[PDB]
Amino acid sequence: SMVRVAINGFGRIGRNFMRCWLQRKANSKLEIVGINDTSDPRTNAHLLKYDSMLGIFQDAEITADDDCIYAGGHAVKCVSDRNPENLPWSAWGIDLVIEATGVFTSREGASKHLSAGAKKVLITAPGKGNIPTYVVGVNHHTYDPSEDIVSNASCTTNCLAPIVKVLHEAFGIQQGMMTTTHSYTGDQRLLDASHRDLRRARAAAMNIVPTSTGAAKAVGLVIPELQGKLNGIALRVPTPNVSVVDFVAQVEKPTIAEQVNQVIKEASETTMKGIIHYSELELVSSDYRGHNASSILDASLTMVLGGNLVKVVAWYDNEWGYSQRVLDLAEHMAAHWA
Amino acid sequence: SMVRVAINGFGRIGRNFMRCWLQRKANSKLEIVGINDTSDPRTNAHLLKYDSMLGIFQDAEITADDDCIYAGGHAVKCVSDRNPENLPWSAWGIDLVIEATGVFTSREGASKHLSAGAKKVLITAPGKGNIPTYVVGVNHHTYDPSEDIVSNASCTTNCLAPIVKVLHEAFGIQQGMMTTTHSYTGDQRLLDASHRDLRRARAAAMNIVPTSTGAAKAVGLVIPELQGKLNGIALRVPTPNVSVVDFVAQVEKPTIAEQVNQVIKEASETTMKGIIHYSELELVSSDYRGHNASSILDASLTMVLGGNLVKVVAWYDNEWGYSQRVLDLAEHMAAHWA
């Protein structure tokens, strides 16, 4: 039996996720059967098909009527209610909700989907509070099928955590600092405008915009040995997609740039295959659009000082790569579903 | 004495208007005493001072507390209610509301301010329905002092109408088409996202985005002879401010480019001084930031074919120039107050 999926929030992640699933549908244990979003089916179908970042969807015809969108004749029922407690999850037999609105990231918020009848919720963002958090390739095998609410962390945590795991196991991470130079996202204003966060208020395509981030601390949730040992910040810049993590760590075992690169290369060919990609090419952000890895190490930028201070730099497609991981986590949950 | 003003909607136009007034307040019949906006005084003061387009406000100190913002010791009371019927206009003695939210552009909507206690409303946008519409330099002297709700039209109408009036009086406009190549504005989405207008839904800093516009037809409101004779469109492009109108007219009296330019230059020195500026310089959009004219004719671009087909091109600072005209109209109302 297929696991019946509803997407709550048909935004950048909701629609990237839908496209990821449509391309991977033949091997899937999931069936996307419903969407809840602020807009109507005709708008959802238009935005699913016509994407400024991904291009026109090529694989199947996308159409809509008053009640549904259709992808290759396969119907996805649509509803529009901003209160999840009202959603038709029991009526639609929903097993798993992909919670992609950005606003139900606490247990109390995400549990509204359970009240409405869904069996499980996967939050496409860091959880607030005591929500189990997973990074595919780092700790997803610790997933417990009895858990009803899980988090797939953030794009940045999914890029950083695999690299941190490899470096920690090879050299022993004592402390580490991160900065993500990140494409702007939909929480920032287009022109300077009211916002409870004075930096997100500022014109996103005109500015380098710092924000705090929990992404580095969150690596301690998925690598518990490093709880409290990592911190960092974000700088949002005027690109619409693709981001880069710069990580500086104090390590126990002395090393040099060549060894750091070799360890990550070896992991990318074996234990982290499909999660970390190792690149010796001199590329730029646009070249990583649509990359399926969580982290692409830019080997040319690795440097070490004094044996013990290590800098690595890794690219990530924050929309598409992260959505591939959301789908991987959902397929893992389906494979272990009781 | 002074006409007491409240700004409803402290956005791009609301804040540009405030800065225009702060620079011109020594000769003003207006006193800005109140602001209503979705956000709080701290946020209002921060965004008034720090502006990605205008730079840091230079003329006076800008501070805030829980209740007010302060500009050079002048206290401006603040409130946050999205329903204008609840606003404290009676208690604050508000005479004139600057309606800059973008959402109360019908008489029914704008009249909510009158119910709350204000005496007049100036809508910083085209009106919807039967609202008297003014363009300073074109028809503002026709202001009827008994009117309670007026419109200052749009930025594009304020740029186009003065040029159209000059061309009509010199050559007789029979028909005309307009395209504005316009900076993106806050009604467009930063990344592709739900919108009832499928083109406004698309990533604004990544795309050329066509939108319909009423600006050409609205010239027929301020030049009644030309009702029904003009039409056009907008192309929103990835600049955050400053726009350009391209106007192609069919005229009755045959002419040539040199004569079209001479007529507009003469008007810019006399009847349209301060409204139209005549430029023979080879400049680009950034050079027109902060220009006080409604329309800057780019004389090098004028062309005529066959005597009767005239093309003119004019720049405008859609935020600052338009806000100067809002202030001019408000001052005109204050000087003709009933």
Binding site: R189, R196, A234 | -
Partner: peptide, 22 residues
């Protein structure tokens, strides 16, 4: 508690309120 704080509690997806932890 301010009106703006209540607005963002009631409408966390509103443009004045969104906080995505990138």
């Amino acid at each position: 508690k301010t009106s703006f704080q209540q607005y963002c509690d009631d409408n966390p997806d509103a443009a004045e309120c969104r906080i995505y932890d990138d």
